Write a protein that binds this ligand. Structure first.
Ligand SMILES: *C(=O)[C@H]([C@@H](C)O)[C@H]1CC(SCCNC=N)=C(C(=O)O)N1
Length: 355
């Protein structure tokens, strides 16, 4: 019992805040100061990429389309860019979207962000409006953007939790955009540029994202995501305190998560979990399940011990029953205790009887 019910100790993490979540279940595996508002620095570009990804998903433009660079995206024409990561765009260049988005995602090019913001939304301010609209849509409680890149934004902030949630949204909602993050290099204007995410080259993990950020003000920041088998984790580490820990602290969290936790998928949408009699219907019985795939994160090795059962909201089911009508709750249990609950819904509509 003692070894089965063990709660693992969390490694010490040399950073101001962090969080470790499961991508599929959303379970928070470990956290410290995860809601404290901090300078996001280049992590802001995750939201820039999310907006671009949404626009591309919507067919607003495609990767082959040429963007004509304007004055505001001219790297050496705007001292706000001094000492920052740049693609080195000049006005009059005609650059494919594919190249600009790799400038953003791999190189953290601040100039590329401006070029894409104007192309996608007409102005930087309108683009930032979109970024903040998605902050609202994603339910983020501790995030606000002022810039398309992270620079020159005194009232901009995010948090470890919110940055992990933006990472989750990238992978979930804009998978074609997310797929770019694992690319180790791209070439622009005859120069090869390497992805800044050093973890991509760590053989011991399968890291395929997401974004790094450093300013002297924000410290060292990293949102990472890695997979092992069925399982995908996302870590966000903000205000990393040393150069030597910039990838090491995140690696500590990810490796710890895979060692102690596992993700299970006990039920898919549309598959019967339970059946109940129904009154007044065109069928004698209601087929019951979920309207969203169930993922649970549990201690590693406890999968065989997982039990499921359900409760019903009402004594009797009466037709008409709508598809996806909520009629109860599924309880998932370990060691006799409910650890997770999901809504139990009608899978196939049952109208009133017609004879
Ligand atoms: C993001 O956090 C900044 C961006 C706002 O400029 C970039 C800069 C760097 S490293 C320094 C590059 N400048 C210099 N020659 C990073 C990084 O994550 O390493 N992010």
């Amino acid at each position: 019992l003692n070894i089965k019910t063990m709660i693992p100790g969390v490694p010490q993490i040399d950073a101001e805040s962090y969080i470790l979540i499961d991508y599929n279940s959303g379970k928070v595996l470990a956290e410290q100061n995860a809601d404290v508002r901090r300078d996001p620095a280049s992590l802001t570009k995750m939201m820039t990429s999310y907006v671009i990804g949404q626009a591309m998903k919507a067919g607003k433009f495609k990767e082959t389309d040429l963007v004509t660079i304007g004055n505001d995206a001219w790297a050496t024409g705007n001292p706000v860019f001094k000492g920052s990561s740049l693609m080195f765009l000049k006005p009059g260049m005609q650059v494919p979207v594919s190249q600009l988005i790799r400038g953003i995602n791999l190189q953290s090019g601040n100039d590329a962000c401006v070029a894409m913001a104007d192309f996608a939304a007409g102005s930087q301010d309108a683009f930032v409006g979109l970024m903040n609209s998605y902050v609202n849509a994603l339910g983020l409680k501790n995030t606000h953007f002022q810039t398309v890149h992270g620079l020159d934004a005194d009232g901009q902030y995010s948090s470890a939790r919110d940055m992990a949630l933006i990472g989750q949204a990238l992978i979930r909602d804009v998978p074609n955009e997310y797929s770019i993050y694992k690319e180790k290099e791209f070439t622009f204007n005859g120069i090869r540029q390497l992805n800044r995410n050093g973890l991509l080259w760590d053989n011991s993990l399968n890291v395929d994202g997401i974004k790094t950020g450093h300013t002297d003000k924000a410290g060292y920041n990293l949102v990472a995501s890695a997979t092992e088998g069925q399982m995908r984790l996302i870590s966000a580490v903000m205000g990393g305190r040393t150069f030597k820990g910039r990838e090491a602290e995140s690696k500590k969290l990810l490796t710890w998560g895979f060692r102690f936790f596992e993700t299970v998928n006990p039920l898919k949408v549309g598959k019967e979990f339970a059946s109940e009699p129904v009154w007044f219907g065109d069928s004698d019985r209601a087929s019951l399940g979920v309207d969203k795939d169930v993922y649970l994160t549990i201690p590693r090795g406890r999968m065989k011990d997982l039990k499921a059962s359900y409760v019903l909201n009402s004594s009797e089911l009466h037709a008409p029953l709508q598809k996806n009508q909520v009629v109860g709750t599924i309880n998932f249990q370990l060691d006799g205790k409910t650890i997770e609950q999901r809504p139990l819904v009608v899978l196939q509509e049952i109208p009133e009887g017609n004879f």
